[PDB]
Ligand binder design. Sequence first.
Ligand code: ADP
Ligand code: ADP
Ligand code: CA
Ligand code: CA
Ligand code: CA
Ligand code: CA
Lengths: 379, 388
Amino acid sequence: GTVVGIDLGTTYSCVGVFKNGRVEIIANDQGNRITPSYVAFTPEGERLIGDAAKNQLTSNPENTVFDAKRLIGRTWNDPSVQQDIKFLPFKVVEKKTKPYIQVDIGGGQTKTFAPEEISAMVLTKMKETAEAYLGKKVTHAVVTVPAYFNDAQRQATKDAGTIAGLNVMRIINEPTAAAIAYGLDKREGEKNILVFDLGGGTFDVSLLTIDNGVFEVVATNGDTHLGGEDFDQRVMEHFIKLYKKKTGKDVRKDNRAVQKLRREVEKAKRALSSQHQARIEIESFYEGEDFSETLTRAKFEELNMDLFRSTMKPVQKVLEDSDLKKSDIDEIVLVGGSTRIPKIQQLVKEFFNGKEPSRGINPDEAVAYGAAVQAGVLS
Amino acid sequence: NLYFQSMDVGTVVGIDLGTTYSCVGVFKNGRVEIIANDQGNRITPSYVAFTPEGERLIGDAAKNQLTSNPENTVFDAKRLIGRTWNDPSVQQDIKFLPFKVVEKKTKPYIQVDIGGGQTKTFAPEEISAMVLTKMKETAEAYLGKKVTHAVVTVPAYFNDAQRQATKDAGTIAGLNVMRIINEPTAAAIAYGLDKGEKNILVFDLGGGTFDVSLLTIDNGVFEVVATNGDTHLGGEDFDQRVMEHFIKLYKKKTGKDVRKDNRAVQKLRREVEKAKRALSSQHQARIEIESFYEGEDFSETLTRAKFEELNMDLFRSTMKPVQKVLEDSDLKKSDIDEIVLVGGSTRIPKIQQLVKEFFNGKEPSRGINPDEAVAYGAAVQAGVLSGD
Ligand SMILES: Nc1ncnc2c1ncn2[C@@H]1O[C@H](COP(=O)(O)OP(=O)(O)O)[C@@H](O)[C@H]1O
Ligand SMILES: Nc1ncnc2c1ncn2[C@@H]1O[C@H](COP(=O)(O)OP(=O)(O)O)[C@@H](O)[C@H]1O
Ligand SMILES: [Ca+2]
Ligand SMILES: [Ca+2]
Ligand SMILES: [Ca+2]
Ligand SMILES: [Ca+2]
């Protein structure tokens, strides 16, 4: 019927549709165009998806599930799983040599879910937000995945669709989707495209060569665990030790203070993508005392200096591996929420000797945008 | 002979001017009171830092900023104080200090950028002066009075040039140092070992130095009979073994080599250090650093057994100088009446266990906080000079 395009992202997902000549990115029933890729199990037996799952994360660390994409379609033995496991606050147990996620569901009950079951529940949220908008049922979808995903990861993403009641007609590589979003599907000779994708917890760089609807991912690279969250973390550290210094108080063991801080740091960072200062204020922050500081853009870039510079290495590396030089790159496509950071943009611009990157698509929505275009072609 | 405090000028302080930390105490109201600093810490890092912006930092704030400001953060000044340039100790040390040490008038001087385009050159005793000034001020905030006189401790092996240079450092700081006393003697005094003829072994293992001293006491007369040790072995080395294990392990679990990233290394060091301290009173320590390297996190458990294994050879080698002081002082291990263990690293259970086994089960002395014992003893002598 009407096929949806879904960006099923690490930290956020996005659903779009092609209806009456254009791509419509669909707002969820809480008013947002992207939805958190979170699922929570409450004590009272209630299953929450999205924003509701995420606002309930501090109070429910063990049964708020996220980052399912990091596990999806992998075996227990994957070195990547072996590391990730140590940092997830929910239980992951080995079963049939695959990661399974184990949560309490209330009434004394435990369940284990395959990562793809958890992703399934995210897809069910996207499905329902699509159907509400379209006024009708949705059964088919184009879902994107990272370019370095192997068959078992792709198949597992397809299985998620099925668990969710979607037929995932096509799986499309995220950089190709971003490429399609910017009209690089237009038939206009051979082009070498660098897609620089920077989300909340992951950095992917992809060199794609395009040739009249023939897309090839030549080389891929990145930092599997570098993202927007890390930039929040540099700033958190700065402020926690500044708070100690002024008030004598250390807040690190107080999960309530810490996460109120994280929440305001997150708001501050976002704002510092289009202002040079943001006031971080919290009332009754710690033992009755308030918190007030202004963060400058200068201080934000200073505290993240090297994380920002180190995004250049995977770029140089993908040009080496595809036997190209920076002069060979015809479009630079910047996608992922964190590419809104002017310094990131500036460091990329500078790297390519003044070339401006393509413009006119929303970086938070680009991958879903591309998927939706192809959904509309597939029909 | 006797010092009389007034209403404006307070009692005599005892100071442990140590290699990596210092501690100041006082005898007041019949007890030794070990004075906490403005940070709430009962020991203070023996560190001075000179920021770009012209601020001189001392203690914890100097140390807090050692990675970002390596060339202008000074420490280990005790390693150079009262020594000639030609001293083989100095020639070795300067190779390893991250701040500049030039020769002036045949003596080592420390040269730092003091802000505003200027450099200054400080004698090691000027740097210890600054540490002593922080200790002075800590005392004065506690006493609500000025502090003008002190008893300061030094290693048994210090010579006259080294003792004089410690006295001069007090002098630069405004402290009349009434008495210099040996650290192990100070440690003996804190355990009451001054109140027939006893033989005392003092095992002092700090952050960077290991000092063993054999001491006789006869009717309140102390004599340092033999001294030995490893002048560069201390708790910092035990961190170094654990650091190496994790840099290696991290490379092979994740591919990532972090060795030349000083921010990551410093971050690991802080957590290894905290871990170590915790393994002196529990059997496992978590080491968790968020965004350790290129956004990737770090998470590992260090067990006490793993900690002992990594340092096995280092711990056992602390027995060789204990044997040498016995040989050199012509005593058998059975001639030792008292074992005193002091220094923060003697909190390590395996170190306690090795010393105890070396003396066929003999228990060490116990009533005093091992990183405060040197100060405590100094503080007690401070009291006898002030009339209590
Ligand atoms: N205005 C902004 N400035 C800086 N970072 C932003 C902004 N908006 C979103 N981000 C960051 O984008 C990250 C999420 O990227 P996104 O692509 O939406 O999700 P995913 O992590 O699933 O790829 C978050 O860390 C968020 O803070
Ligand atoms: N609980 C503990 N367990 C193990 N080592 C400790 C503990 N507390 C302190 N230390 C070690 O003691 C060393 C410092 O000893 P100290 O006598 O305080 O100073 P100095 O080095 O100036 O003699 C440090 O290496 C520190 O890690
Ligand atoms: Ca994304
Ligand atoms: Ca050493
Ligand atoms: Ca990260
Ligand atoms: Ca000591």
